């Protein structure tokens, strides 16, 4: 039906059968990722041609190859074989993740450490983290993972609050082999428990929460169709579902009067990045490249009806490929409902007597995914007004250290002898514009401040000015809060009736970006965080601000090199790549487990519409 | 018993009772503002004396006064009279702005204008806006309002269409003369009609929103008690309702176990202007003290219930003077009610196998007011986790001009011919703070970057430093969304478990602050604008950030006045006075009737707790 319909259980086991019948998927291989490609660019094209890309991993250590393949045809678009120390490894492999932990409980260097601070090896659980690329040439073309190690005193222990600082091991998943075990010294390790499940802890719980129930008598006001095709007052979008990105939103347009207007291609967070600012070295290499390295949607939570997702809710349950090609769906990975959101607009005029009020409502469409200590909820709402929005939700436990004695710069205490190193939580939303249709172009729009004197003797005077993006190479941007700084994207070929360009401004919540030194690892891995805006022509091939293999690779791909390409972005078929993020410095509220903190950006009509369109709304 | 309570019907009547007793209110006498009296401080106040300021006008051109009233003894403890071109004028009658219609309606000058542009002049409504100080010295010590013109076709017909531009009228309300009539020249009167109640503009009304229904089938979390009292998930804290400045929160405090700790004394919205930016001497001195000129509690609307506000709602019905002392109730002035917050906090660990999710939930207490065109809804919120939360909501029906032909620098176009001028709607909250009592002290906190280096190796490091603000000197600060600036208050004198003061931190939206020229009156008399944190030792005096008589007063009343004093802040009991606003440049999407557009600022615990607050919380 749809060529953005979600993969089906049966596309991928083809997918596998494919790669089988290519020789492409012997015993030793395993997907280390797959996921359905988007229709090329064309208003229907020629037929559906489900494509689907993935990369193959080699547990005997031969080359590993990225393959497209077309379910639609049984034929293998393409297979390359991949030069891993140069483009990148493949993402990491949950049963790669499990080995860290075992191998170490063998390894004499790990038992001598464990020895050292009188630890039973086998109440130590490791967390098994990505190495990034830093000073050890070892590494260069082998798969390892760094693992760091947290006490669990019984089976239903938080592990979190008992770090072993001044300990890290540094494993080769593939080899199987224990490359570096790093002791810099013994540390007290935390003895309180952090089980906020624990009536010790926790106390009596309270009992003056009454009940408030959200239902929908005669159900929803969206309808869902061929599956994943949503459709919402007057808004009209299909939700994809990629193992990587997570909840993928395609075609996002509005219906205005008899059209169906394009307003955003491609909606998604196309990675996303948690930097640690603890200069030791137990932990100065800790980069979590959610998306990138991990892939948030392999990890998303069945969603439980009540508490997870309230009211009248949807669900989808996403298919996506296990290590061997075979087809595991996610149970209620997503949810989609409808809330109400306060007024939407009134007036009470004296004039006419007129008392005029509306409420306003938002579509949400959301999925949690976890990452080892965190969880995070991605929420994407579509408002009656027009406003598109995405909201991330920060929760779960923080991530631990050793307190240091004489206090740190670096990190902060949440219990005693507990530490939680600074850290950020940084975003980049890959939005490919469509404004009413290809031909969009961006424009920088800043608060101008007009001095008193001719003209403007009072001195009250204030303006805006816009700055069109041209070129790629002028299309990094930063933020500018004070001058009210904001990007519209518009369509120079459409106009709305009062002969402007229609358009969406993006409105950014301004935080800060990547912290980082400039000329660290992590700011060239992650050079799109450095930047709150980036502005880029499409191509199919520029998924990811940091590339299609993030996983121990340098710089050298992603943004930066896409931009260099300096390609004309005015009036042309553009994507908007913004970072933004959160700066945490954990605070004694975070721990036991902290309460969500969010992060977001959105978008708001700009002369998009001839007036507002939300005139039809009921009293209701 | 509470001297927190509202003022009652029979307080008012009693206040009225007082003054006519007194002589103080004769038949040219005016109630310009009455409110009750905020207890002093007093850590064991046995003697209730409940008093009541009042500001009275003098119809015959007579000083005004300053009334200080005793209710329970049924004394004038104070009397004072006031020289308005000293001290500025107080605050508008609505019986003056009826007068300015009337007036013009009969003058020359005003008819000849009208004429000029074929307007029938029973068909023109005036908006009656405050004056403001210019270069009018014979205006100095007089009572002056400026009206702008809007055509109203009909009676429900939406004024606002069609304002009359080159046209502006200045009116002395107590003499009753018309001091100026100036036309700058005829525009053309927008045409296009913006009734959005009109079928003909709405088009046949949306049948696809299915109801969303909210309900409480055992009643609200919340317990109201005395009256105004409110108990709800730990907090504790007195609504109170002030005719200028509207809702006000009291005794903001958190039960964390036995003790019941104070957050913020006192938390209110202590002005608010919308200063505009279009250089027209038609609307140049435009710019609305919404607080202090036109005080917004007074315009508080009657919610209905199911619209205004849904679900299960408590109202409180405050009760105002009129303009002669006659108590008149704002019935449902004021919603009471909790909402469902979606996730609190949640983890899916797979060490421990424990799943854990839990809803989180907000304590609203709002109330709406309407200032002519504008409609602002004023929302308090306490989260669960003790986060303190102010959020303004802007809608109503943006001011208009003509467009002037060749675009403009300061106005946008919304419909043929029709004009928006520029502006801003900035805030001022003023929160008396209390973190554990009154010594409190305020430092700047900012995101410190670090280079790579010595100590710092792989330039992943960041950190972050605070400034105490020691003296009002340095205490006027600007936001830095770049380096991640916040201001935390905090008690040095009560330390949590970790032994660091308890502190809460406030998180600034850090949008654009005051744009006027540094040397326009506006900058000088709305100054509190121009930055967006000012931080005061208390003084019962010093309410307002423009002063007690905000109406026609020169400049540099309030805030700048209060800091010239360079008091002790370290550790003293001390006012932190937050600005932020919206600065709108409307689109074609906020006519005819604006959607609501919002502006806020939020405050988190800072190490107030000893862990978090929320682990009692059931599972639900
Ligand atoms: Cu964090
Ligand atoms: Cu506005």
Same mark, same amino acid.
């Given at each position: 039906?749809?060529?953005?319909?979600?993969?089906?259980?049966?596309?991928?086991?083809?997918?596998?059968?494919?790669?089988?019948?290519?020789?492409?998927?012997?015993?030793?291989?395993?997907?280390?990722?797959?996921?359905?490609?988007?229709?090329?660019?064309?208003?229907?094209?020629?037929?559906?041609?489900?494509?689907?890309?993935?990369?193959?991993?080699?547990?005997?250590?031969?080359?590993?190859?990225?393959?497209?393949?077309?379910?639609?045809?049984?034929?293998?678009?393409?297979?390359?074989?991949?030069?891993?120390?140069?483009?990148?490894?493949?993402?990491?492999?949950?049963?790669?993740?499990?080995?860290?932990?075992?191998?170490?409980?063998?390894?004499?260097?790990?038992?001598?450490?464990?020895?050292?601070?009188?630890?039973?090896?086998?109440?130590?659980?490791?967390?098994?983290?990505?190495?990034?690329?830093?000073?050890?040439?070892?590494?260069?073309?082998?798969?390892?993972?760094?693992?760091?190690?947290?006490?669990?005193?019984?089976?239903?222990?938080?592990?979190?609050?008992?770090?072993?600082?001044?300990?890290?091991?540094?494993?080769?998943?593939?080899?199987?082999?224990?490359?570096?075990?790093?002791?810099?010294?013994?540390?007290?390790?935390?003895?309180?428990?952090?089980?906020?499940?624990?009536?010790?802890?926790?106390?009596?719980?309270?009992?003056?929460?009454?009940?408030?129930?959200?239902?929908?008598?005669?159900?929803? /006001? #969206?309808?869902? =169709?061929? &599956? @994943?095709?949503?459709?919402?007052?007057? +808004?009209? %979008?299909?939700?994809?579902?990629?193992?990587?990105?997570?909840?993928?939103?395609?075609?996002?347009?509005?219906?205005?009067?008899?059209?169906?207007?394009?307003?955003?291609?491609?909606?998604?967070?196309?990675?996303?990045?948690?930097?640690?600012?603890?200069?030791?070295?137990?932990?100065?290499?800790?980069?979590?490249?959610?998306?990138?390295?991990?892939?948030?949607?392999?990890?998303?939570?069945?969603?439980?009806?009540?508490?997870?997702?309230?009211?009248?809710?949807?669900?989808?349950?996403?298919?996506?490929?296990?290590?061997?090609?075979?087809?595991?769906?996610?149970?209620?990975?997503?949810?989609?409902?409808?809330?109400?959101?306060?007024?939407?607009?009134?007036?009470?005029?004296?004039?006419?007597?007129?008392?005029?009020?509306?409420?306003?409502?938002?579509?949400?469409? /959301? #999925?949690?995914? =976890?990452? &080892? @200590?965190?969880?995070?909820?991605?929420? +994407?709402? %579509?408002?009656?007004?027009?406003?598109?929005?995405?909201?991330?939700?920060?929760?779960?436990?923080?991530?631990?250290?050793?307190?240091?004695?004489?206090?740190?710069?670096?990190?902060?205490?949440?219990?005693?002898?507990?530490?939680?190193?600074?850290?950020?939580?940084?975003?980049?939303?890959?939005?490919?514009?469509?404004?009413?249709?290809?031909?969009?172009?961006?424009?920088?729009?800043?608060?101008?401040?007009?001095?008193?004197?001719?003209?403007?003797?009072?001195?009250?005077?204030?303006?805006?000015?816009?700055?069109?993006?041209?070129?790629?190479?002028?299309?990094?941007?930063?933020?500018?809060?004070?001058?009210?700084?904001?990007?519209?994207?518009?369509?120079?070929?459409?106009?709305?009736?009062?002969?402007?360009?229609?358009?969406?401004?993006?409105?950014?919540?301004?935080?800060?970006?990547?912290?980082?030194?400039?000329?660290?690892?992590?700011?060239?891995?992650?050079?799109?965080?450095?930047?709150?805006?980036?502005?880029?022509?499409?191509?199919?091939?520029?998924?990811?601000?940091?590339?299609?293999?993030?996983?121990?690779?340098?710089?050298?791909?992603?943004?930066?090199?896409?931009?260099?390409?300096?390609?004309?972005?005015?009036?042309?078929?553009?994507?908007?790549?913004?970072?933004?993020?959160?700066?945490?410095?954990?605070?004694?509220?975070?721990?036991?487990?902290?309460?969500?903190?969010?992060?977001?950006?959105?978008?708001?009509?700009?002369?998009?519409?001839?007036?507002?369109?939300?005139?039809?709304?009921?009293?209701?």
């Amino acid at each position: 039906a749809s060529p953005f319909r979600l993969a089906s259980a049966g596309e991928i086991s083809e997918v596998q059968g494919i790669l089988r019948t290519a020789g492409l998927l012997g015993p030793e291989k395993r997907i280390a990722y797959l996921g359905v490609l988007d229709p090329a660019r064309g208003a229907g094209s020629e037929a559906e041609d489900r494509r689907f890309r993935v990369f193959i991993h080699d547990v005997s250590g031969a080359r590993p190859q990225e393959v497209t393949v077309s379910v639609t045809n049984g034929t293998v678009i393409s297979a390359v074989e991949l030069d891993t120390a140069a483009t990148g490894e493949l993402p990491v492999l949950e049963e790669e993740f499990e080995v860290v932990e075992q191998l170490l409980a063998t390894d004499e260097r790990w038992l001598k450490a464990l020895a050292a601070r009188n630890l039973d090896v086998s109440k130590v659980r490791v967390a098994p983290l990505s190495a990034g690329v830093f000073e050890y040439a070892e590494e260069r073309g082998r798969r390892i993972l760094r693992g760091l190690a947290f006490v669990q005193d019984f089976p239903e222990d938080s592990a979190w609050a008992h770090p072993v600082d001044g300990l890290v091991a540094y494993v080769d998943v593939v080899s199987k082999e224990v490359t570096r075990v790093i002791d810099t010294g013994v540390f007290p390790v935390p003895a309180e428990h952090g089980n906020y499940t624990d009536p010790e802890l926790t106390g009596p719980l309270r009992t003056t929460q009454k009940p408030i129930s959200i239902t929908q008598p005669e159900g929803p /006001s #969206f309808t869902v =169709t061929g &599956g @994943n095709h949503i459709e919402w007052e007057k +808004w009209s %979008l299909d939700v994809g579902f990629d193992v990587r990105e997570g909840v993928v939103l395609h075609n996002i347009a509005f219906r205005d009067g008899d059209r169906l207007r394009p307003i955003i291609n491609r909606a998604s967070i196309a990675e996303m990045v948690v930097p640690y600012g603890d200069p030791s070295p137990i932990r100065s290499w800790q980069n979590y490249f959610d998306t990138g390295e991990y892939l948030v949607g392999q990890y998303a939570n069945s969603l439980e009806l009540g508490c997870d997702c309230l009211g009248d809710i949807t669900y989808l349950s996403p298919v996506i490929s296990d290590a061997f090609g075979n087809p595991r769906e996610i149970r209620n990975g997503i949810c989609m409902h409808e809330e109400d959101w306060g007024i939407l607009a009134k007036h009470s005029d004296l004039w006419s007597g007129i008392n005029y009020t509306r409420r306003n409502r938002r579509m949400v469409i /959301s #999925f949690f995914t =976890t990452i &080892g @200590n965190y969880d995070y909820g991605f929420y +994407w709402y %579509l408002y009656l007004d027009g406003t598109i929005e995405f909201e991330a939700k920060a929760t779960g436990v923080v991530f631990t250290s050793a307190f240091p004695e004489g206090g740190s710069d670096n990190i902060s205490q949440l219990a005693p002898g507990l530490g939680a190193p600074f850290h950020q939580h940084i975003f980049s939303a890959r939005l490919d514009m469509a404004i009413d249709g290809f031909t969009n172009r961006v424009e920088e729009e800043d608060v101008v401040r007009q001095t008193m004197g001719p003209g403007n003797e009072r001195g009250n005077a204030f303006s805006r000015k816009r700055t069109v993006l041209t070129r790629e190479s002028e299309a990094v941007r930063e933020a500018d809060a004070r001058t009210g700084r904001t990007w519209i994207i518009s369509n120079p070929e459409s106009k709305n009736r009062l002969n402007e360009p229609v358009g969406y401004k993006l409105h950014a919540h301004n935080q800060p970006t990547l912290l980082a030194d400039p000329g660290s690892s992590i700011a060239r891995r992650a050079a799109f965080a450095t930047k709150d805006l980036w502005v880029t022509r499409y191509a199919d091939d520029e998924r990811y601000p940091t590339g299609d293999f993030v996983n121990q690779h340098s710089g050298g791909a992603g943004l930066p090199s896409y931009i260099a390409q300096d390609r004309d972005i005015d009036g042309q078929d553009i994507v908007v790549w913004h970072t933004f993020g959160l700066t945490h410095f954990p605070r004694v509220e975070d721990w036991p487990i902290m309460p969500v903190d969010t992060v977001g950006f959105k978008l708001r009509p700009e002369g998009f519409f001839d007036r507002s369109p939300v005139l039809d709304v009921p009293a209701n």
